[PDB]
Amino acid sequence: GCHYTPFGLICF
């Protein structure tokens, strides 16, 4: 469950 963010990909 990761998401592509403008600051950096994050997973939780």
Give the helix, strand, coil percentages of the chain, each rounded to 5: 0, 35, 65
DSSP 3: E
Whole-angstrom CA distances from 11 to 1, 6, 7 are 6, 14, 13
Parallel/antiparallel/unpaired status of strands 10-11 and 2-3: antiparallel
Method: NMR
Cα separation, 9 vs 11, in Å, equals: 7
Confirm if 10 and 1 have CB atoms less than 8 A apart. Answer: no
Is the backbone of residue 8 left (phi > 0), alpha (psi -120 to 50) or beta? Answer: left
Main-chain dihedrals φ then ψ at residue 10, nearest 5 degrees: -130, 145
Structure-token pair, residue 12: 């939780």
Is the backbone of residue 10 left (phi > 0), alpha (psi -120 to 50) or beta? Answer: beta
